[PDB]
Design an enzyme around this catalytic site. Sequence first.
Site, PDB file in Angstrom:
ATOM      1  N   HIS A 120       4.487   2.861   6.584  1.00 57.83           N
ATOM      2  CA  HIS A 120       3.690   4.014   6.975  1.00 57.83           C
ATOM      3  C   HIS A 120       4.528   5.265   6.847  1.00 57.83           C
ATOM      4  CE1 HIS A 120       1.057   6.487   9.649  1.00 57.83           C
ATOM      5  NE2 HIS A 120       2.205   6.893  10.160  1.00 57.83           N
ATOM      6  N   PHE A 121       3.918   6.294   6.278  1.00 59.29           N
ATOM      7  CA  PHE A 121       4.551   7.598   6.069  1.00 59.29           C
ATOM      8  C   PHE A 121       4.172   8.361   7.307  1.00 59.29           C
ATOM      9  CE2 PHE A 121       4.924  11.728   3.609  1.00 59.29           C
ATOM     10  CZ  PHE A 121       6.143  11.468   3.002  1.00 59.29           C
ATOM     11  N   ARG A 171       0.816  -1.208   0.000  1.00 63.08           N
ATOM     12  CA  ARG A 171       0.000   0.000   0.000  1.00 63.08           C
ATOM     13  C   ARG A 171       0.855   1.267   0.000  1.00 63.08           C
ATOM     14  NH1 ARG A 171      -2.868   3.226   3.725  1.00 63.08           N
ATOM     15  NH2 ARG A 171      -4.678   4.133   2.648  1.00 63.08           N
ATOM     16  N   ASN A 211      -1.068  14.091  -0.951  1.00 61.92           N
ATOM     17  CA  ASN A 211      -0.234  12.891  -1.025  1.00 61.92           C
ATOM     18  C   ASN A 211       1.152  13.197  -1.572  1.00 61.92           C
ATOM     19  OD1 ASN A 211      -0.262   9.812  -0.793  1.00 61.92           O
ATOM     20  ND2 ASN A 211       0.418  10.075  -2.911  1.00 61.92           N
ATOM     21  N   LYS A 225      -8.176  12.397  -2.630  1.00 64.05           N
ATOM     22  CA  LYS A 225      -7.356  12.453  -1.431  1.00 64.05           C
ATOM     23  C   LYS A 225      -6.733  13.833  -1.306  1.00 64.05           C
ATOM     24  CE  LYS A 225      -3.594  10.219   1.098  1.00 64.05           C
ATOM     25  NZ  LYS A 225      -2.528   9.179   1.065  1.00 64.05           N
ATOM     26  N   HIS A 236       2.976   5.931  -2.507  1.00 66.42           N
ATOM     27  CA  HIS A 236       4.086   6.880  -2.310  1.00 66.42           C
ATOM     28  C   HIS A 236       5.352   6.711  -3.120  1.00 66.42           C
ATOM     29  CE1 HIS A 236       2.045   8.506   1.199  1.00 66.42           C
ATOM     30  NE2 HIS A 236       1.765   7.255   1.522  1.00 66.42           N
TER      31      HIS A 236
END
Length: 120
Positions: free
Chosen positions: A117-118, A8, A44, A41, A13
């Site tokens: 995860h960012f 994901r 991003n 969104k 990203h």
Amino acid sequence: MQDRMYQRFLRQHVDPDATGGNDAYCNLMMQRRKMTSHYCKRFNTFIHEDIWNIRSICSTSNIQCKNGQMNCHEGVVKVTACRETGSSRAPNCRYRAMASTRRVVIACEGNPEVPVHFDK
């Protein structure tokens, strides 16, 4: 699920190929990486580094995440920040790009430690 999150992250990203970004880059990429499918969104960030170039950040020194966890890592990469124009509606989403080399912070989980995860 450690992995499925990693996927994901890559999807949302990572574009190693793109050099930098213009407005049309975002419009295209946000749609392609499936972030306009229902709603646009807000904001991003796309990292322009090779996948392994990035995973290497998970082996830089640990630091504390926003949420107090200690599995965050910082590094300096080229990115494109896609932000929604406001003159955009759904699902005909529209964005204004922002290219820069900047600091980023990512959580890394799993074995081996992969980016999931960012943080920033």
